[model samples]
Target: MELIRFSISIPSKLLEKFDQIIEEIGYENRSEAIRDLIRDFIIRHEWEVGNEEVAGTITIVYNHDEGDVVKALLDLQHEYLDEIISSLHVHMDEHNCLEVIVVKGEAKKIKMIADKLLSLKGVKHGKLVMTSTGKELV
Candidate 1:
């Protein structure tokens, strides 16, 4: 890829904070960090549009002992077999379990899946970490 140089005006205070954060997070240069931020912005825009094909993970922590929680989770996943590519289950303890479900499909459908899982009765905590499939990024 050919590199392009550009300039923009930003508040000095904002720039200072960004520079500090990027340095703390180990970004070698501002250009590289800004490029990542731009790509992330594009991915977020695509997700908000809700019609694009995207990828994300739905993580949920639940207690198996909760009434029908295990069955409900499995049954829900089965309903979206086409969107759900894979899942990992870990025995956090005797009764608690952590599940990470990898899903790739239309953003709308993926969001629906996450919402359903996260709202289930026994799910103590959950999050959907959405990202692009990489096809839209340069």
Candidate 2:
């Protein structure tokens, strides 16, 4: 592989914050940290293209006792079986459940399914972690 160097301009305050965070997290240098950010940006770009293949997980936290949440979630899961690869469920407490759904497919479809799960009545909070399948990154 060949290495290339280029210059970029950014706000000083933004760079300050970036340095602080990267150092706090043990990144060795600015170039290493910038490379990681660029890789993440590329992965995000992949998801913005509707037909690009992607793999990621959707995490949801909800109260199990709330109205029809479980059944509604199950129904939606069935609806997107082609995209959903697997899922894991855990009981957070007596009444709360945390579910992590693993998915792989076109980016648009993944976002659609994640949005549907997050908007369910009992879902208190959720996040979709979008990432690449390691086929296109360095």
Candidate 3:
């Protein structure tokens, strides 16, 4: 593979903060962190366009004691049978459950599913981690 080098200019304070954060995160140098940032930017842009095929995970934390929450989640997952690949369920406690659903498909559809899952009444918190399937990254 060929690598190209480029230069970017930014405010001194912003660069300083970036350097501090990457260092604390154990990045060996600025270039590696910048590469990751660029990749994330590309992935986000892909999602925004809604035509790209992307992969991501939707994580949700909810309480099982909440009425119909578990069944509702299961029904929703069944609706997207082609997009959802698998899921991991963890019993956080007697009442709390954590779920991570691995999904792949069109960006628009994935975002739709994420929104549906995260908006359910019993969900306490949730997030969709957008990423690539490695087909476009390299």
TM-score of candidate 3 on Cα atoms, chains taken together: 0.93
Instruction: Please tell me which model should have the higher TM-score, number 1 or number 2.
Output: 1
Residue range 17-97, candidate 3, lDDT tens digits: 999999999999998898898899998999898687899999999999999999999999999999999999999999999
Overall lDDT per candidate, in order of appearance: 0.93, 0.93, 0.94
Lowest lDDT block of 10, candidate 3: 44-53
lDDT of 2 by residue, 34-130 (tens): 9998999999989986577999999999988999999999999999989999999999999999999999999988999999999998899999999
Badly placed stretches (over 4 Å) of model 3 are none
Off by over 4 Å in 2: 9-13
| Cα error, candidate 2, residue 58 (Å) | 0.9
Model 3, residue pairs in steric clash: none
**Cα lDDT of model 1 by residue, 1-138, tens digit:** 897788899899999999999999999988889999999999999998758799999999999998998999999999999999999999999999999999999999999999999999999999999897998789
- RMSD in Å for candidate 1, one decimal? 1.1
lDDT of 1 at 136: 73
Q: Rank order by TM-score, top first?
A: 1, 3, 2
> Highest TM-score among the candidates is held by which one?
1
Best-first order by lDDT: 3, 1, 2
